[PDB]
Design a protein around this ligand. Structure first.
Ligand SMILES: CC(=O)N1CCc2c(c(-c3cccc4cc(-c5cnn(C)c5)ncc34)nn2C2CCOCC2)C1
Ligand SMILES: [Zn+2]
Ligand SMILES: [Zn+2]
Ligand SMILES: [Zn+2]
Length: 212
């Protein structure tokens, strides 16, 4: 019940250096300094594919007017901008490779900064894809396979006992967001894998090290 409230200036002063570190990159930040403009750039299908645009100058504006209540909302907007560019642009394009550079930079900046706002780290996604099971046989990362509605999986060399059975293609290269658990006292979202350990149990709810 002693919830942590971040004031705008606390967030701005801590996080703006991670944004400036992206803005610094030349030429890699140049497609990202201003909102995507589909008529000017002559890409009329952009908003058919990208439903929620995001860019460095919008993120800076939101930090400047205190529209972030807690720092993961900022991290989410950054990854939104990256994921928009990776989706819209082809793997071989300049814009895409620029995006992967900005991402590398951010992942190296964000952890100390999130730790100074009291968090475990600042990494949004899992390190590794989840080993999928082949319907004893399992599928490693990046391995190719066939799927149906996310449910049943088969390795390409193959392709509940009481449930009456009935009778596309992908690659296992996707990272899920790293799941969270809330501090019972301050309300901070921490990563389960960062703060929960095989030998500790939390009968009355997780409490982070700042609140202990
Ligand atoms: C971020 C995103 O998803 N966008 C969507 C696609 C896009 C963007 C930019 C773009 C916008 C503003 C500045 C840019 C600057 C450079 C640049 C500057 N120096 N260097 C070596 C490259 N490149 C692309 C830019 N173009 N396109 C393509 C337009 C069609 O034609 C091929 C490129 C934005
Ligand atoms: Zn963490
Ligand atoms: Zn198999
Ligand atoms: Zn706490």
């Amino acid at each position: 019940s002693r919830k942590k409230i971040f004031k705008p200036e606390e967030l701005r002063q801590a996080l703006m250096p991670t944004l400036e570190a992206l803005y610094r990159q030349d030429p890699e930040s140049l497609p990202f300094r201003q909102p995507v403009d589909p008529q000017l750039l002559g890409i009329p299908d952009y908003f058919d594919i990208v439903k929620n645009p995001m860019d460095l100058s919008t993120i800076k504006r939101k930090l400047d007017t205190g529209q972030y209540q807690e720092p993961w909302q900022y991290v989410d907007d950054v990854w939104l901008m990256f994921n928009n560019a990776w989706l819209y642009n082809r793997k071989t394009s300049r814009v895409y490779k620029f995006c992967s550079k900005l991402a590398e930079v951010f992942e190296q900046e964000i952890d100390p900064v999130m730790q100074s706002l009291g968090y475990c780290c600042g990494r949004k996604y899992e390190f590794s894809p989840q080993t999928l099971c082949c319907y004893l046989c399992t599928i490693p990362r990046d391995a190719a396979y066939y799927s149906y509605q996310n449910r049943y999986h088969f390795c390409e060399k193959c392709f509940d006992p009481s449930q009456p059975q009935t009778t596309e293609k992908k690659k296992n290269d996707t990272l899920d967001p790293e799941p969270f658990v809330d501090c019972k006292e301050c309300g901070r979202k921490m990563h389960q894998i960062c703060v929960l350990h095989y030998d500790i149990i939390w009968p009355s709810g997780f409490v982070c090290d700042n609140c202990l």
